[PDB]
Ligand binder design. Structure first.
Ligand code: CLA
Ligand code: CLA
Ligand code: CLA
Ligand code: CLA
Ligand code: CLA
Ligand code: CLA
Ligand SMILES: CCCCCCCCCCCCCCCC(=O)OC[C@H](COP(=O)(O)OC[C@@H](O)CO)OC(=O)CCCCCCCCCCCCCCC
Ligand SMILES: CC(=O)O[C@H]1CC(C)(C)C(=C=C/C(C)=C/C=C/C(C)=C/C=C/C=C(C)/C=C/C=C(\C)C(=O)C[C@@]23O[C@]2(C)C[C@@H](O)CC3(C)C)[C@](C)(O)C1
Ligand SMILES: CC(=O)O[C@H]1CC(C)(C)C(=C=C/C(C)=C/C=C/C(C)=C/C=C/C=C(C)/C=C/C=C(\C)C(=O)C[C@@]23O[C@]2(C)C[C@@H](O)CC3(C)C)[C@](C)(O)C1
Ligand SMILES: CC(=O)O[C@H]1CC(C)(C)C(=C=C/C(C)=C/C=C/C(C)=C/C=C/C=C(C)/C=C/C=C(\C)C(=O)C[C@@]23O[C@]2(C)C[C@@H](O)CC3(C)C)[C@](C)(O)C1
Ligand SMILES: CC1=C(C#C/C(C)=C/C=C/C(C)=C/C=C/C=C(C)/C=C/C=C(C)/C=C/[C@@]23O[C@]2(C)C[C@@H](O)CC3(C)C)C(C)(C)C[C@H](O)C1
Lengths: 178, 40, 193, 107, 180, 47, 193
């Protein structure tokens, strides 16, 4: 019996991705063989969550902003670094990430914590174990979509110079013409 | 990190380097904030 | 809690649970408690806001002197939308802090609503049972005890009516604000608001 | 010809800022004598973004070397039979390392 | 799947302080696991001392702007220029009073072992209770937890007051009322 | 200070810059924080 | 699915399968299901398109305004073909959006026309069974349920009629397009086309 990936059915399965959510076998470059799956999945969830927040925040700041912050999305980072409101995020997220590195250290040493589980579930979404696997897969799907979403947001915004849609001026007309 | 890495950081040269770096930093910052103090 | 037991089913959507998008089927029944607490809170705040906004649009205001120099008519001159911005910051903070006390006391009660209590049943006496604090035992909801004359079935029917009117009030208050922000979006609104 | 090359700046702590001498070009620092400026001029670097990016690339290469050193002792270590292939080693170091290094530098 | 999660940070293992009998232990808040290294009783003795100092300081800092000791020289409404302006031989006497109290209370017990060498000697139980609230043992736990929480809040509050005064240059109440 | 909500609007609408011609790659490359000589120097922490 | 089992053979080619090339006999079984679904889709698209093109050439247009400033007569003044460019991009965007929804919903249904589903049978009520989505139960095919008053043999006859009409429809629509592009290629197309 030989295992083939469900995403690349011309390759043999890695065999290191067993017992994980979103396990279609997408790992052609074999990072799981070298690095541990716990570290890799913690990184995946961190990128997923930060990218979801980033892609929502980029679009939101394109429309609305607080009275004190009168900057656009592109110059917001520089303006707020000058103002000191990015240090206030790096200090209060760096505290969170100090606790996070303690956590990932513990789970890599085998404390029992999962890859990206912090236990943060106040409202009780998915407290039933049956729904937790489905919600984990949906989390990964939305986050992996949001990574490309934020990448497209930033790149197209800088490339076009247009506010929300990130589309060239000619793309707002005659885009369905024979 | 672990008991093993904590023991390694507790080894003599690592502790001496850390403590002397802390002492040098204290002296340097004291010099920055109270420079050129020839006498009390 | 469980989407079933809750009473909000009505004739307008047929005598069934109205969950078109299946939000209730992807929750662990712990969050349905939070949703009925928040639904009722939204509906109640929305109907208070709706009657207040209608009062403001009609132009009725208190006799005068909200503050020292400011008058109620002057601070509500430019309709109800700008009235909040016009109100004094001190009195605004007192409204916000009394609401903070109310919504902190409601949360601090032991059964809660998410952890096995009734979602929607705000404690009648929020400020009692607190060591080192004193309040004059005026119960927050139904201070005069209008509900004593009501039996179980009557108050169930009235809870149904509460949910219906709160939902309608949510729609109404959002209609008011959207109609102000976007002229002509709500055609049943005049120049008063 | 007029500007003295300099790529080190000392902080002002104990009066050591005097070491930031006048090197020309509105810059104060310690004059260097490693020839790296002339090296980069020969290489064709004319701006600082190029220096910054090759420095970042060097950092990436250093991290790659640390990873390779870990990998080739703790994960996949060769055998003495692999090590003793001196003929193949000489072939690869003559044609592969030196030869292609010179070819790429010539290009 | 942590076997013994921390009651405060449930994605971390239980610290040693969580499985202890001092007051306020259940929170289990110790992300850095400093209870494993530092002696736990010695740190409650420090926690309580710091909290007591800070909860004397914070009301003092907050009310010295409003009130003056009648006739005191060198008074300033903000604590920092107040200490700058006040005569040094008043701060010296305050420090001497504090040092006398500390020395006489901790006589022959100033080290982690010498203090708490006696098994009876409890963390922070220096014996200062003239009114004898401690004889009533029903509310002793309540009072201990309240002292701990108030001391911690006072540490944070005094830190905030001092640093806000550094930021603004104005006393606590003036700086606060110039926000709204 | 403009406390958003009490003495100021909660959220101000953002400046709609209108859809127009694109910029030039050189234009936004000679101002980038990683591919501009002065952009690199403007990326050092002030502190 | 499998060529002998499909209602494709007709009286046009001697009651025999018409595959002059060796396609159907060279391709596997599921390729034929794909081809049959594609044939039905092409036939039906062209069957609507030929009628639409005929109406556009005839100039029969709705009385009203397509947008607040544009008329159906205005967009049809440039002949049947240029009407697609004349119509607002924000309207053909909605048309392509609903077509995207219909195609994706039809493709998402499980049995699948290549994996054990009837080829050419677009599933009725495509927007049902979808989490986080509601749509009224209006069938995509026969919303008034005309098929209910038909028997299975009559329905097979009508399936054959559908196929033989759709093939002629794609012949006709390509005739219209080539008549517009190359002039005089297709006679019977006057200047209105
Ligand atoms: C063992 C001999 C010795 C002695 C007695 C001193 C004494 C002193 N040195 Mg030091 N010094 C020494 C060796 C010595 N040095 C050596 C070996 C070096 C070479 C690295 C230096 C280089 C050096 C420098 C460059 C400086 C000093 C300074 C000082 C002063 C520090 C006071 C201070 O800032 O306190 C502050 C403490 C508090 C506020 C508390 C003090 C007079 C500093 C100074 O101000 O000199 C006048 C200064 O700038 N020293
Ligand atoms: C310098 C100011 C100051 C002082 C002197 C105190 C003193 C006290 N606080 Mg603390 N506290 C402070 C600031 C201060 N607090 C601040 C700014 C906060 C943040 C909001 C808190 C939040 C806080 C909480 C949440 C609790 C305390 C409690 C306590 C009490 C400890 C337990 C006890 O023995 O109660 C025994 C009871 C008494 C001695 C009598 C009741 C207290 C009276 C009402 C105080 C006077 C209030 C005054 C009229 C203003 C009202 C507005 C004690 C009276 C605990 C407590 O038990 O409070 C009752 C408690 O639950 N405090
Ligand atoms: C019964 C009260 C009522 C009435 C008569 C109107 C009337 C109007 N509103 Mg609306 N509006 C209402 C309540 C009402 N509104 C409320 C409560 C709100 C607050 C949320 C709004 C918010 C609102 C906005 C933000 C806007 C309007 C606009 C309009 C105008 C055009 C709407 C349109 O094209 O509908 C078309 C309706 C249909 C095609 C039928 C609906 C049924 C289909 C099948 C549902 C499809 C669902 C979809 C797939 C999901 C029109 C004057 C627009 C306007 O012109 O503003 C200036 C506009 O921009 N309204
Ligand atoms: C590894 C080294 C190296 C590399 C990567 C390149 C790369 C290139 N050379 Mg070559 N080149 C090299 C060494 C190298 N050269 C050497 C040693 C010589 C001297 C004999 C030349 C002489 C040379 C010429 C004369 C030309 C190129 C050109 C080219 C292009 C190749 C076009 C193609 O693939 O067809 C490309 C920029 C062409 C080009 O695009 O020039 C601008 C071209 O005309 N090269
Ligand atoms: C102490 C200062 C303060 C006060 C008194 C208020 C008061 C208010 N803000 Mg807020 N606001 C503040 C700071 C403050 N804000 C800050 C620092 C920001 C920037 C992040 C905002 C950003 C903000 C926005 C964007 C909006 C408000 C709005 C509001 C109103 C509704 C509050 C609400 O729904 O609470 C609900 C309370 C909670 C969800 C609990 C939060 C956590 C607790 C406090 C701990 C109210 C007038 C709204 C408005 O404009 O109304 C007219 C509104 O849209 N505020
Ligand atoms: C693109 C549209 C299309 C498609 C996908 C099919 C598909 C099919 N037809 Mg065909 N058919 C079409 C158009 C199409 N037809 C038209 C327009 C007519 C009228 C002349 C017919 C008349 C017809 C008959 C009478 C019969 C079929 C049958 C079949 C099936 C078996 C033959 C086969 O393997 O075809 C595979 C088809 C393809 C791979 C498409 C290849 C297209 C090439 C590459 C380009 C052709 C260019 C064209 C000549 C330009 C004209 C302008 C198959 C499902 C037989 C059947 O169902 O038997 C059970 C059958 O009896 N068809
Ligand atoms: C920014 C606002 C966000 C909150 C920030 C923190 C400040 C409020 C914290 C108070 C916690 C203090 C705290 O320890 O409360 C927590 C405590 C826990 O509840 P208990 O278990 O005591 O009560 C439940 C039962 O025991 C009662 O029988 O709650 C109370 O005692 C009841 C709630 C009274 C709440 C009413 C007072 C609200 C606070 C005062 C409003 C003014 C704030 C000052 C501005 C002028
Ligand atoms: C026509 C057209 O084109 O558009 C329409 C659409 C559009 C825009 C949406 C419109 C709107 C707005 C709408 C729909 C607004 C709706 C507002 C709504 C629904 C407002 C409820 C308030 C309820 C309160 C205050 C309850 C108090 C309740 C109290 C004080 C009690 O406890 C009463 C009670 O104690 C007694 C006395 C004793 C007992 O017997 C029973 C109990 C204990 C219960 C317009 C303007 O209609 C135009
Ligand atoms: C006097 C007064 O009233 O002043 C007020 C009025 C005034 C000025 C109006 C104010 C304002 C502005 C405010 C508050 C603005 C708020 C803006 C806000 C909150 C904007 C959210 C955007 C969310 C997005 C884009 C989400 C898309 C989400 C998407 C694409 C989805 O639906 C995902 C989806 O998965 C679901 C969920 C269900 C699935 O079945 C289907 C899919 C997969 C598609 C203030 C500040 O309040 C002050
Ligand atoms: C001589 C010469 O060279 O000529 C030239 C010029 C000329 C002729 C113009 C040319 C052309 C074009 C051609 C050949 C065009 C052909 C167009 C074609 C073949 C167009 C079909 C439409 C079918 C529709 C819309 C069906 C609707 C069907 C509906 C709405 C139903 O379901 C009806 C029904 O449900 C009821 C209501 C009740 C049920 O009980 C029964 C059913 C299910 C049935 C050429 C090719 O250039 C050649
Ligand atoms: C979730 C997650 C992570 C994360 C994350 C991220 C990226 C989180 C980001 C959070 C974010 C972005 C939070 C902003 C808050 C802003 C506030 C409170 C603003 C206050 C603003 C105030 C108080 C005032 C503003 C002013 O304008 C006012 C009103 C008046 C003006 O005169 C001037 C001033 C300046 C005074 C980890 C940790 C990385 C990994 C983990 O695995 C998953």
């Amino acid at each position: 019996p030989v295992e083939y990936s469900e995403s690349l059915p011309f390759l043999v399965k890695r065999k290191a991705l067993k017992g994980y959510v979103g396990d279609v076998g997408f790992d052609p470059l074999g990072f799981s063989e070298i690095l541990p799956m716990d570290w890799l999945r913690e990184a995946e969830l961190k990128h997923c969550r930060v990218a979801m927040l980033a892609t929502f925040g980029f679009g939101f700041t394109d429309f609305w902003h607080f009275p004190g912050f009168d900057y656009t999305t592109l110059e917001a980072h520089d303006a707020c670094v000058a103002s000191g409101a990015m240090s206030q995020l790096l200090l209060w997220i760096g505290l969170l990430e100090v606790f996070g590195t303690i956590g990932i250290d513990q789970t890599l040493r085998g404390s029992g914590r999962a890859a990206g589980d912090f236990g943060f579930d106040p409202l009780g979404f998915g407290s039933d174990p049956a729904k937790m696997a489905d919600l984990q897969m949906k989390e990964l799907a939305n986050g992996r979509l949001a990574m490309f979403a934020f990448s497209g947001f930033v790149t197209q915004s800088v490339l076009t110079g247009n506010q929300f849609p990130y589309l060239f001026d000619y793309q707002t007309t005659d885009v369905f013409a024979l | 990190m672990s008991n093993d890495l904590l023991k390694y950081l507790s080894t003599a040269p690592v502790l001496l380097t850390a403590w002397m770096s802390i002492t040098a930093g204290i002296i340097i910052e004291i010099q920055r904030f109270f420079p050129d103090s020839l006498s009390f | 809690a469980f989407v079933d037991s809750i009473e909000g089913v009505g004739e307008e959507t047929g005598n069934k649970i109205w969950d078109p998008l299946g939000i209730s089927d992807a929750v662990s029944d712990e969050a349905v408690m939070w949703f009925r607490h928040s639904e009722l809170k939204h509906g109640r705040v929305a109907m208070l806001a709706t009657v207040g906004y209608m009062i403001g649009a009609a132009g009725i205001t208190f006799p005068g002197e909200i503050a020292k120099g400011v008058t109620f008519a002057s601070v509500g001159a430019s309709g109800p939308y700008a009235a909040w911005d016009a109100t004094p910051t001190a009195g605004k903070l007192q409204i916000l802090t009394i609401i903070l006390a109310l919504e902190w006391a409601a949360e601090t009660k032991k059964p809660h609503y998410m952890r096995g209590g009734v979602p929607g049943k705000i404690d009648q006496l929020p400020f009692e049972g607190i060591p080192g604090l004193w309040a004059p035992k005026i119960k927050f909801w139904d201070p005069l005890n209008f509900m004593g004359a009501l039996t179980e079935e009557q108050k169930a029917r009235k809870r149904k009516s509460e949910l219906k009117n709160g939902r309608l009030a949510m729609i109404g208050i959002i209609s008011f604000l959207t109609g102000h922000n976007i002229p002509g979006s709500v055609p049943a609104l005049d120049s008063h608001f | 010809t007029a500007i003295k090359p300099s790529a080190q700046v000392v902080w002002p702590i104990v009066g050591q800022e005097i070491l930031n001498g006048d090197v020309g070009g509105g810059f104060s620092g310690v004059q260097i004598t490693s020839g790296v400026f002339q090296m980069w001029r020969a290489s064709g670097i004319t701006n600082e973004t190029e220096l910054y990016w090759t420095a970042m690339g060097g950092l990436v290469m250093s991290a790659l070397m640390v990873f390779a050193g870990w990998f080739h002792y703790h994960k996949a270590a060769p055998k003495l039979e692999w090590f003793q292939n001196v003929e193949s080693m000489m072939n690869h170091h003559l044609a592969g390392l030196l030869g292609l290094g010179c070819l790429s530098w010539s290009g | 799947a942590i076997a013994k999660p921390s009651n405060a940070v449930p994605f971390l293992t239980a610290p040693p302080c969580q499985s202890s009998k001092l007051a306020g232990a259940e929170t289990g808040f110790d992300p850095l696991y400093l209870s494993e290294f530092i002696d736990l009783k010695w740190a409650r003795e420090a926690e309580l001392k710091h909290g007591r100092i800070c909860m004397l300081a914070a009301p003092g800092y907050f009310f010295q702007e409003f009130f003056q000791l009648p006739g005191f020289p060198g008074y300033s409404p903000n604590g920092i220029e107040a200490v700058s302006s006040v005569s040094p031989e008043a701060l010296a006497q305050i420090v001497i009073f504090m040092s006398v109290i500390e020395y006489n209370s901790n006589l022959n017990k100033w080290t982690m072992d010498t203090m708490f060498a006696d098994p009876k000697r409890e963390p922070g139980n220096l014996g200062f209770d003239p009114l004898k609230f401690g004889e009533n043992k029903n509310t002793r736990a309540r009072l201990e937890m309240a002292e701990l929480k108030n001391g911690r809040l006072a540490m944070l509050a005094f830190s905030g007051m001092v640093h806000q005064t550094f930021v603004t240059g104005k006393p606590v109440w003036a700086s606060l009322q110039d926000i709204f | 200070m403009t406390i958003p909500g009490v003495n100021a609007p909660g959220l101000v609408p953002a400046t709609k810059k209108s859809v127009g011609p694109k910029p030039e790659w050189d234009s936004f490359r000679d101002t980038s924080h990683f591919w501009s000589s002065e952009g690199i120097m403007n990326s050092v922490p002030k502190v």
